[PDB]
Amino acid sequence: MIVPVRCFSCGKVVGDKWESYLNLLQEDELDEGTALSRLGLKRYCCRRMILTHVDLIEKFLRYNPLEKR
C-alpha cells in the first residue's frame, strides 16, 4: 500500500526513498536501475523493494469520507 519501511531481506531502511525515486525518474529522467543505485540500493534484495513498489495508497486516499466532494 504505502512504501515499506525496511527491505524484507536486508533490514535496510527503504521508506525514505520512495518520494525521491519518483523525482529521479521524473525530473532527472534516469532509468530505473540508475536511480536505484543513486539512492544506495545495492543488493538486489533492496533494489526490488523500490523498483516494484505499487503506491496503491494514493488510490485509497481518493475516497475520503470526511470531506464534501
Partner 1 sequence: WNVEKFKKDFEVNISSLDAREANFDLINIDTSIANAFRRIMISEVPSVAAEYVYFFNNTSVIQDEVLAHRIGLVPLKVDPDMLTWVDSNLPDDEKFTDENTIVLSLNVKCTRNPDAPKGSTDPKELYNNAHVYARDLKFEPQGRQSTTFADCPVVPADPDILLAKLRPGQEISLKAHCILGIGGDHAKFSPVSTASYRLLPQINILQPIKGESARRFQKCFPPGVIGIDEGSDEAYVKDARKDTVSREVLRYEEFADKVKLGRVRNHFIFNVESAGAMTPEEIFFKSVRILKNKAEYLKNCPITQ
Give buried/exposed letters for 19-37 (b at 16+ CB in 10 A, else e).
eebeebeeeeeeeeeebbe
Does residue 56 bind partner 1 (CB under 8 A)? Answer: no
Does residue 50 bind Zn ion (CB under 5 A)? Answer: no
26 DSSP assignment: H
Per the annotation, does 46 bind a ligand?
yes
Site string for Zn ion, 10-49 (x = CB under 5 A): x----------------------------------xx--x
Distance CA 11, CA 8 (A): 6
Point out which residues bind partner 1 (CB under 8 A).
Answer: 1-7, 9-13, 15-16, 18-19, 43, 45, 57, 60-61, 64, 66-67
